[PDB]
Structures are given as C-alpha cells and as structure tokens.
Amino acid sequence: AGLKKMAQPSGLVEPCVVRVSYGNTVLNGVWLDDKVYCPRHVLASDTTVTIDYDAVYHSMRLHNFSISKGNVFLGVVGAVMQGANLVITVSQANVNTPSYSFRTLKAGECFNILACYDGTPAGVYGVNLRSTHTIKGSFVNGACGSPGFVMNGHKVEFVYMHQIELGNASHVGSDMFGNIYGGFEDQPSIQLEGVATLITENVIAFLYAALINGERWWCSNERCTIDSFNEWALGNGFTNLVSGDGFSMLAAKTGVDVCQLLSAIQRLATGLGGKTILGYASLTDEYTLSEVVRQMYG
Amino acid sequence: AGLKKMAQPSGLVEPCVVRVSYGNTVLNGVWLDDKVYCPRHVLASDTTVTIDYDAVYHSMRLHNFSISKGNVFLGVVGAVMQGANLVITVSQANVNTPSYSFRTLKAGECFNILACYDGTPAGVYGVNLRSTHTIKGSFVNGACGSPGFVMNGHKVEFVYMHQIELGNASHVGSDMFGNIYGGFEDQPSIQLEGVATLITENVIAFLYAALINGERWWCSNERCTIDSFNEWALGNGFTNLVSGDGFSMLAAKTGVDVCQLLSAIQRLATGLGGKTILGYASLTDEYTLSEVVRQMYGV
Ligand SMILES: *[C@](C)(O)C(=O)N(c1ccc(-c2ccccc2)nc1)[C@@](C)(C(=O)N[C@@H](C)c1ccc(F)cc1)c1cccnc1
Ligand SMILES: *[C@](C)(O)C(=O)N(c1ccc(-c2ccccc2)nc1)[C@@](C)(C(=O)N[C@@H](C)c1ccc(F)cc1)c1cccnc1
C-alpha cells in the first residue's frame, strides 16, 4: 500500500566499507576478502593538469597507503589498476565478507547507494541509472568510493562505486570491473551530460501503479501501437520499447492493455494538468516493474 | 548534492527482526535481549467486531507460539501484554543485541522504517511523523510488527512498531511501550483520520533546500512576523513556530532570512501554480532541518 523510493537493507554492504587514505586525500573503499577497491584517482592530487594514470601507477609508494575499518589498520601489500579502480591487496581478510558478485547496470535498473564518508556509512537510498548512465543521488565531498548495490537472495551484487560529480548535480560511478558508466573520464576537464530521456518501461509500471491504486482519471479508451510510439518517442525525449511481454502479468489483473498506457503517455507526457498522480505533477521513471510488484503484491 | 529522502544504515537492526507466529496470524517482531516485542493483535485472529484483549490475553496457549529467525526456532517462555504490545520472553538471547533504547516521537521528526514480511527484512526508507501522528509509507499484508528506529551514534532507538492500516492509506504504529500513536484502536471498527497540518520548521527547512539548490523563483523580499504567521497558521493548516535560532546557520549561507520564508509560506501554501519546487507539486514537511543539513553541507 503506497509508493515510495525505498532502499534494500544495507546490512551486508555495511561491514565492508573502509577508509582509504593516500597522503592528504582520503576516501572510501570497498573491502572484500583480502582486496580493497577504490577509485584510482586517490593516487592523484593534481586536480588541475590532465592526469597520466599510466605513469602514476608505476610511480606509487605503498608506504603512504593507510587503510582502516574503524580503529583497525589493514596492512597494504600490493595494488594493481583494474580500469578506473585501484584494486589494493591487504593482509587482513575481511572476516565480514558476504557472498558477493560483480554485475554491470543496464540503464533504467534500480540499485541502492550506501553513501559513505571516511569509511563510515551515512545513509542508504535507492536510485535508478538514467538514460545518460548517470544517477541523481545526494553526494557531498568525500563520497568517492561509496558502493552501490543490488541484493537478490542474501547475495550482494556490487554494481557501482562512486567516482566523480558532474556539474549537472549528476553522479558518475565506475563499475566494479573498472568501467566508467556513460563513457566519462576521471579527468579534471569539464564534462557535460546528454539530455536525460525518460525510461519508458519505468513510466509504464508507474502507470499500472496508479491504476492498482484506483487513479483512473487519466486513462481513456485510446490505444497506440508499439511502433507509432517508438516513432513519436525519440522526438519527445522518451526511450523506445522492445516488447511488452512482462507487463502481461500485471495487465491482466488490472484489465488495462499495454497499448492503452502508450496513448496515455503520449498525452500525459508534459501533459499533467492541475491534477497530480500519486503525488507527482510530472511523469517519473524512478519505479521499475520489479519494484512495483514487490510493493503491490508482496 | 541532491535532495533525496534517505534512511540511516539498518545493519544493527537486521539481526533482531524475527518471525512471530501464533496459529493463523504470522507477523514480524523485534528480538532484543531475550525478549521479542510484537503487536498484541497477533493473539486475535478476528477482524469482525471489537475484541476483548483482556479476555484474549488469558485465553493464550504459549504452546501455540512459533518464533523463528530463519531456520533457527526460538523457544517461547513468557508472555505479558504491555499496552498494545506483547513482550515475549524466550530462552536464547539475541547475541547481537545492539546498544538499544526506546523513545516516543514528537510529531514532525524523521525516523527509519524497516519493512518486513515473514521475518525477512525487505526495505528501509526515511519517513517523518505527520501532525495527525500517522506516518505515510509502504506496507503490504503481513508487515505488522516491522520496527521503526532512529540511530544516534551506533545506538539504536526503537520508536515504532507497525499495527494497522487506516482508510486514508495512513499507517498507524505503537511505541515499544505499547501505546498506539495519536491514540488509535487496534480494532476492526471504522476509525477517522484527522486533517494533516504541516509542520512549519520542516517546510522552512525544505525551502532552504530549494534556495541552496538554486530554485529561487518563489522568493522575494517579504518579512513576516512570527505571530502574524502563527495567527495565520492556526487558520490555514500549519503549526505555530517556537524558535528559528537553529535556522541561523542556513540563513547566513543563503543570505535569505527566516522571515522571508515565513511570508513565502503564506504565498505558496495556496498553490504552486503548476511550478514545482525541487520536484514537488505542493509544500512538503518531509525533510526535517537536521536531515537537510547532512545532505546540503554534510554534517
Ligand atoms: C572525491 C575525491 O572524494 C570527491 O569528493 N570529488 C572528487 C575530487 C577529485 C577527483 C579527481 C581528482 C583528480 C583527478 C581526477 C578526479 N574526483 C572526485 C568531488 C569533490 C568532485 O568530483 N568534484 C568535481 C568538481 C571534480 C571533478 C573532477 C576532478 F578532477 C576534480 C573535481 C566530489 C564532490 C561531491 C561528490 N562527488 C565528488
Ligand atoms: C498484519 C496481520 O500483518 C496485517 O497485515 N494487517 C492486520 C490484520 C489484522 C489486524 C488485527 C487483527 C486482530 C485484531 C486487531 C487487528 N491488524 C493488522 C492488515 C491486513 C490490516 O491492518 N487490515 C486492516 C483492514 C485492519 C485494521 C485493523 C484491524 F483490527 C484489522 C484489520 C494490514 C494490511 C496492510 C498494512 N498493514 C496491515
């Protein structure tokens, strides 16, 4: 009953956040087994001239690393560079290591940001990757290395590590495989995101959310083809639709066709009059199909 | 960098949530130090008429009780009804019982809800108590006994325990002392919900979040005395403000005083005219002052 951007329980991610301190600059690290993942820009302090990472890696002094989880210091042994990640090998092994697996996020999916500062978690909240492979969370200085995760069946899927904040207030993270989302760079040059187009299959589950909760005022008998929308979608800041197979489960209980919401979206997109839907005066892509089913039918 | 309702880390609370079952009704409970707390309506299975809890508490067979945390089954020992809650004593002690304590919340504060189903933690999100003393969150069938909590320095303070769901989709819970908030009944008979009046400080904090976040189209140079607003707040669905000395820090960083917002509240409470503030169609008391300071400046 209701609809809120809720985050999954952060309890398993929480023991792994460490404080990685290389010289002056100190940031957040994900500690799993004997390895500690952190953004490689910790090795940089320039923040003014283009950084030649290939050279600074070979010219690194491990005596300056001091990694910690509270009062314990983990002893640094080695460190290799996996993309934009600086995978650091420490002697102590995280006794608190959950069952983890790395995965990459496909645009539109939801995941959980464990905002951390100085190796201490601050808050957990759910976000979705946008059409530009950037997120719109809440971050302040020192968050570099805060993990993002999805969790299915007592197993953590580290899908995000924070790297940098764009001027857009948009946040760019790396993959745990070392791959910047959206093709951006950890470089001190100005970078601009593209136009954020709303993810269509999240807006649909958001409209079934309104019909399950009885708000049927916006809905009418009109229906549009998957095709005519895909044509209309690009020119109106929306993503195209591949198929409508998964909604058929919800479409039956509601009795509202998939082709019928499309006619509504073409109308409702930049169309909400005074009347709002579920607390929103504009369509939103925050809510996925998975999230709707967990908040509506257990 | 953004305004994002977020919950504090729920790691310490997750060891304590247990599956409490008494025959048909199965719902969640908090396992603190060898005592499981749960709503007293787990004993009742009837949702027709008003139920004599004093007579149902005595018609209680402890042998019927089934508590479990995963595969482990707890052995129930004692059971005393405290208010609208059930303090159940068991043999094993939650060995991971955090630095815990109870509290009752004055209206307007923000706390952290841990929704559970079948003794399984499932989500965690921030919510603030409305003036009617009903939070408004997400709860499906079987979430009775999901604890709320607020954490000040690794010490867990349990403040909520889910009891019932009203008509307005408003959610009602009980403190760990066994008192239904706002004075409600855990009975099936129909029950009214009050008119939600907005907490003024949390609206002011929400407005500073907008001035810090750039949206300054609604702000002009109007200063309003606090009493004229209080006289106006008693007649327009707001609350009277006690002090604005905590806002002294946000006012200096924005350069906008607290008086300007107070007049601005009188302006926009009528309606935002289709122009949203921070992605919000109307004024919102969701963001408390302290939570706004951790997100904007990071304390
Ligand atoms: C990290 C260090 O904790 C941090 O908060 N930010 C940051 C700072 C510097 C770098 C960086 C330095 C040298 C080379 C490459 C990257 N990355 C991240 C903040 C302060 C940040 O990103 N600021 C922006 C303006 C920035 C971009 C690029 C850059 F090189 C330097 C700064 C930051 C603040 C808030 C949230 N996230 C990150
Ligand atoms: C709990 C059992 O998990 C549950 O979801 N609900 C509930 C059901 C019954 C009682 C109750 C039983 C006996 C005596 C008094 C109360 N409390 C809670 C739900 C289904 C619920 O609250 N339904 C409403 C209609 C209800 C209110 C009051 C009442 F006495 C009986 C029923 C529920 C649904 C969704 C969210 N929370 C609770």
Describe this structure in words.
2 copies of one chain form a homodimer. The first copy, chain A, has helices at residues 53-58, 200-212, 226-234, 248-254, 258-268, 289-296; strands at residues 17-22, 25-32, 35-39, 65-69, 72-74, 76-82, 85-90, 110-117, 120-128, 147-151, 156-165, 171-174. Chain A is α+β, with helices and mostly antiparallel strands. The first copy, chain A, folds into 2 domains: 1-194, Thrombin, subunit H; 200-296, main proteinase (3clpro) structure, domain 3. In chain A, strand 2 and strand 3 (35-39) form a beta hairpin. Bound molecules: the ligand *[C@](C)(O)C(=O)N(c1ccc(-c2ccccc2)nc1)[C@@](C)(C(=O)N[C@@H](C)c1ccc(F)cc1)c1cccnc1 (2 copies). One copy of the ligand *[C@](C)(O)C(=O)N(c1ccc(-c2ccccc2)nc1)[C@@](C)(C(=O)N[C@@H](C)c1ccc(F)cc1)c1cccnc1 binds next to strand 11 of chain A. Residues 25, 27, 41, 44, 46-47, 51, 139, 141-144, 164-165, 186-188 of chain B line the site of one copy of the ligand *[C@](C)(O)C(=O)N(c1ccc(-c2ccccc2)nc1)[C@@](C)(C(=O)N[C@@H](C)c1ccc(F)cc1)c1cccnc1. Chain A: It is found in: Host cytoplasm, Host perinuclear region; Host endoplasmic reticulum-Golgi intermediate compartment; Host membrane. Chain A: Residues 1-298 form the Peptidase C30 domain. Chain A: Belongs to the coronaviruses polyprotein 1ab family. Chain A: It comes from Swine acute diarrhea syndrome coronavirus.
